[PDB]
């Protein structure tokens, strides 16, 4: 396999289906990436993650750099070997979590210094250091380090952060390219910024395309703006990105958000929703989400979802999973997470198949009618 | 298969190896039973419990009667179907946990009333109700309901509780026999009491043998007396029980306790040690236990144990499991528990094979020399 090859096999409107080939494996798109926080997709062995259909997982650089440490992971043979996942891994840059989770952050044009939320230890991230950490982890898809823009943002602040992010995107590109082993075996994605403003989104797309990346993320969405606004921004933002490269919507999302984002040209997704909310009792079904802790499920012998092909739905009842979650049992988290990740992968498979067959518009309509009934 | 058939295939000294055949499966003895608290062996799917080699698991009646409830489990098809384990299950009587976990307990010759530790709800257990609950769960091996004796106990109190336990053993026998479906498909074990006193242990054995049971537990040990005293009591107590029926040492134990108990004629064991201590960071190895949280393991690429055949030791390092446990990750509990239960099953297999080959005495000596090096 090549370092990186994205091929589009079929299209319907703005939606696309295809494959990313990388040295460690093939990624089917549109793709959903389960999130590995600290070298584990929570409550699942990697073989179970694979059995649900995932082709690639996400690793959180911020968490990994704090525990167990990036240099330590490298000394132990890299993240893949350490955690037991041998297929592609996309790593985020660490920048978002620094701002959401860490303390005493000091921002500058050079990068950010911050105190760990676990022990108050002091740390630094910059374009160069983030790329280096992702190299030490052995990431297959490396995210450029940027400066996130809160929502809402004034035009001036959105412009300043987008402009800084574009300068940092060039620094990220040069850092990645100056490390031969990384440049030859991994891929680098740039991140479009600009908040909700079309002109800033266009300037950001133009800057990123001039630098040149293997893929392009739409950053700065799913930060409180709501689905209508997110879709409005995607409507104009995705067409600005190079058509022939993957489009990655970071931190999205709920099933309907995924369907609508694919309708707008997005190829890749990640979110903690299926794992995190699974441990909290929310199970996804084709008839909408349910909270398994509700007393109405205490004697319900049906599986979580009536059609789902996952091992949890083949073997256990809602009543059992209800009991486990109410009791705080680890097995409850395991089963809910496996089902939710499997549900997400089945959603992506239905999306891919419907695009390939030219019936994605109908699929989206049928999906919504039933999910929101 | 028959309802119950225990056959001894080989002996060495007081040690025995053989099989219990029951409708749901064959149990190889000496046997270790992983403990299912509230319809789950914590952090393991039932298929993983089976893959480690377990032939039978224990269910805690006290926990199950409180959550999800015995009548509810029966309405949902029984414990086996509910939890996804189709092989034999031994259920305890609930009496021990009532005394260790519940509140406002009121004891009498009829039984015990108590308040749930979860919500203060009021409940009753008696010989008759305990046997009925174990029937509602669909237990394969039912434990007679007894009155536990604390350690230390005066001779008078030990005698009074043993005598009550023997009256309750007859009530348990009659309750079990008066339920045709239970009598025809499950087995009933009686529990020897008498604290550390030989004369009371003998009276208890005589009373139990006169009633007649499918197996005989040695109760009231592993309650703070220490290994030397436990072994001293086993020395005289096990020979008092019928030779041709299984001997079950409840709530034992550490690997060396198991080896010495087998040397004294015990055929069956259960304990939370491998599961509970696994979640706390203790891993069993042939060179003794280790605490994986210790900083010395942070960069140790070796498996938990150098010889263990379990899937955890085939795939992951001490360094990874160290990280998971330190981080509080669910996968850490999953992997530690799978390894510890697998280790226990490999111990039982080595015990069975060595007895079958007439080299158990040598095995015990070699095991101790290395485990306590
Ligand atoms: Zn499912
Ligand atoms: Zn192992």
Swiss-Prot record, chains A, B:
Q: What is the effect of changing residue 146 to A?
A: Abolishes catalytic activity
Segments traversing the membrane: none
**The keyword tRNA processing is annotated on this UniProt entry:** yes
The record's EC number reads 2.4.2.29
Which top class of enzyme applies to this chain?
transferase
Stored InterPro entries: ArchSynthase1/Queuine_TRR, TGT, TGT-like_sf, tRNA_ribo_trans-like
What reaction(s) does this enzyme catalyze?
Answer: 7-aminomethyl-7-carbaguanine + guanosine(34) in tRNA = 7-aminomethyl-7-carbaguanosine(34) in tRNA + guanine
| Catalytic residue positions | 92 (proton acceptor), 270 (nucleophile)
Q: Which cofactor does it need?
A: Zn(2+)
Superkingdom of this protein's organism:
Bacteria
- Keywords, comma-separated and alphabetical: Glycosyltransferase, Metal-binding, Queuosine biosynthesis, Transferase, tRNA processing, Zinc
One annotated GO molecular function: metal ion binding
Q: Which Cys pairs are S-S linked?
A: none
Name the protein family.
Answer: Belongs to the queuine tRNA-ribosyltransferase family.
The protein's name is Queuine tRNA-ribosyltransferase
Q: According to the entry, what is the taxonomic lineage of the organism?
A: Bacteria, Pseudomonadati, Pseudomonadota, Alphaproteobacteria, Sphingomonadales
What gene is behind this protein?
A: tgt
